[PDB]
Structure formats: structure tokens, C-alpha cells
Paper text:
Previously, we reported that T. vaginalis cyclophilin 1 (TvCyp1), a cyclophilin type peptidyl-prolyl isomerase and homolog of hCyPA, plays important roles in regulating the nuclear translocation of Myb1 and Myb3 proteins and forms a homodimer in both crystal and solution states with the active site residues highly exposed. As compared with TvCyp1, TvCyP2, containing an extra segment at the N-terminus (N-terminal segment), as shown in Figure 1A,B, is found primarily in the endoplasmic reticulum (ER) and regulates protein trafficking of TvCyP1 and Myb3 toward hydrogenosomes and also TvCyP1 toward the plasma membrane. When adding TvCyP2, the cis/trans isomerization rate was enhanced so that new cross-peaks due to chemical exchange, such as cis-G54 CαH/trans-G54 CαH, were seen, which confirms that TvCyP2 is a catalytic enzyme and possesses PPIase activity. With the SEC-MALS experiment, the molecular weight of TvCyP2 was measured at ~20.01 kDa in a solution similar to theoretical molecular weight 20.947 kDa, TvCyP2 forms a monomer, which agrees well with most of the single-domain CyPs but not TvCyP1. The secondary structures of TvCyP2 contain 8 β-strands and 3 α-helices, β1: residues 16–24, β2: 29–36, β3: 74–77, β4: 81–83, β5: 116–120, β6: 131–135, β7: 148–154, β8: 175–184, α1: 43–53, α2: 140–142 and α3: 157–166 arranged in order of β1–β2–α1–β3–β4–β5–β6–β6–α2–β7–α3–β8.
Numbering used by the authors: 5 to 184
The structure:
Amino acid sequence: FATRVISAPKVTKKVFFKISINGEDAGTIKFGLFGDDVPKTAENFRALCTGEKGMGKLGKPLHYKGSPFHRVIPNFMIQGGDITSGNGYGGESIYGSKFADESFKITHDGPGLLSMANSGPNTNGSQFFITTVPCPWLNGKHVVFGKVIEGMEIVKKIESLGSQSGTPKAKIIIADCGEI
């Protein structure tokens, strides 16, 4: 017996980041994941939040805890999730290697969307970005899989610490993370 009329992917799992900036607590971002529509991508992100898969194949934890927001661009997006080298050139999915683009059905229509960073077709790992504006030119190239449901103010604060090139002007860390 259906009862809702939703104009968006349904949120099926909720996760969070606790953010530190230059070593100080900056608040919590909460995310809703679109697990009915992109389950493999949603499940990857969820498991990296909890750390429950333990160690990956590259000698590093399959866990977002401690990873930085390494590229931060005002009026575009903020990007993080390098859990291997922790500097923006690495990352690892829970599936053992990069994984395929699951679906491009969900587009970059607005700010606050969670989407996979990549290095071309079918190269999803752990790195992600959060949009701060509509990014339609990224449609068909990046898999959207969730959205900010609380703490968009924190995303905007992070965004304000970036630069046009993306080099951050502060050290922004996922100090803790998990599933709600």
C-alpha cells in the first residue's frame, strides 16, 4: 500500500561525518543514501563510514575516519575520501578494486548531493564529492548516490576554506564517522 509521492530517490540508509578543522570540532554532517536506486554504490559508502570491512588490500583500513577533504572549491564542490594515501591521489572500494559506474539516472541537479569522484569510466573507489551548486555538466560521468540531510551549514563552512584551484586553506578531516 503505497503512501508517498517523492520527487527524488528515496533515502534508505543514513550515515554521518564528524568534521574537524585545524584540529577543532566543527560539527556533524549527516547523509541520506539512495540504496534502492544505486545499492552497490550506497553500500560502498556506508561500509566505509562504519569501517566494518576491516583492512583493505593496500594495507590501509577500509574506513573514512581520518581522511581529509583534500580539494575544496567555492561555488563548485568539496571532495574527500582518499583512505589510502590520504592526499587525493588514492582510494579503495570495499569490492577489492575500483568498481563500475552503477547508474547515471540521478543527476547533479543541485547543491548537497553526494557523488563519486573518479578518473574516468568505471573507476569508482572511495573518493566522493559533495556539490555546493548544480553541476549538470557532470551528468553521465559521476554516479550520484546520496544527499546531505543535516549539516549543510558545515559543508558551506568547509567550502569557504577552499580556493579556485581547490587547494584547501585549512586542514579539514573526517574526525569520526558511522551509520545512523
